[PDB]
Amino acid sequence: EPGAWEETFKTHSDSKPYGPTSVGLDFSLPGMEHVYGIPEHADSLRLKVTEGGEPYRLYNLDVFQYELNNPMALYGSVPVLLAHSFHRDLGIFWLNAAETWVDISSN
């Protein structure tokens, strides 16, 4: 309920005339232990699990004096994730232009 319509962050207000409209989907990759991509983040080549913390964010933002080893969104966003194993390679292309969060969990 809170923030589903009109929402404020710091001193800025989002009138959000359309209300909650988000979309989401999960994908399971059997045999995959290494995933890569979804730039841009000042983070490792091999993407980390997000279970204990923030998901990776894709939202083109100007971050003054950005720091290293964190999933904060930087200037660019390419919603493409690659999965590599000894046996195969796979890719996922999430063609969406809005703010996007990506969660990664191991098994």
């Binding site: 988000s22 969406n96 969060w101």
Partner: protein
């Protein structure tokens, strides 16, 4: 860097709503009565069991061993945004064919193999295999969420 300037997922209300859904049996399920198989795409209606909002799944096999999944509202109040100018062309399609059937699942074959997609109706799910080796599953953890456009205020 000043990290209070930039939202966390909790401070992004749509991220908080989405991330609050926990792994379990999905409330979405496919109405196999609605299935239509054309040369270019398979369409099938989805329904949220609690809210009864109706979605449309457009499933496509593509040339060069690719699959495209598109999901929209069945009759939205207003059209939703579809990203232009990024794709360089209309992706060439590969024909889908029914190769396995029961009350709660449908198996489709892309062109002449080896790739096949099994659609389980309840709970809604998609699995992709080369012959019989499972490559990846969709909505297997039941985390799918599609906030339909509600009435303005």
């Amino acid at each position: 860097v000043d990290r209070s300037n930039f939202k966390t997922c909790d401070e992004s209300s749509f991220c908080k709503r989405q991330r609050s859904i926990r792994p379990g049996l999905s409330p979405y399920r496919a109405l196999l009565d609605t299935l239509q198989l054309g040369p270019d795409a398979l369409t099938v209606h989805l329904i949220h069991e609690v809210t009864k909002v109706l979605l449309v799944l457009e499933l496509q096999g593509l040339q060069k061993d690719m699959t495209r999944i598109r999901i929209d509202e069945l009759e939205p109040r207003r059209p939703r945004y579809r990203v232009p100018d990024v794709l360089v062309a209309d992706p060439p399609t590969a024909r889908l064919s029914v190769s396995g059937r029961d009350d709660n699942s449908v198996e489709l074959t892309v062109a002449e193999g080896p790739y096949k997609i099994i659609l389980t109706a309840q709970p809604f799910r998609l699995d992709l295999l080369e012959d019989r080796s499972l490559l990846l599953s969709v909505n297997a953890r039941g985390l799918m969420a599609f906030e339909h456009q509600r009435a303005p205020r």
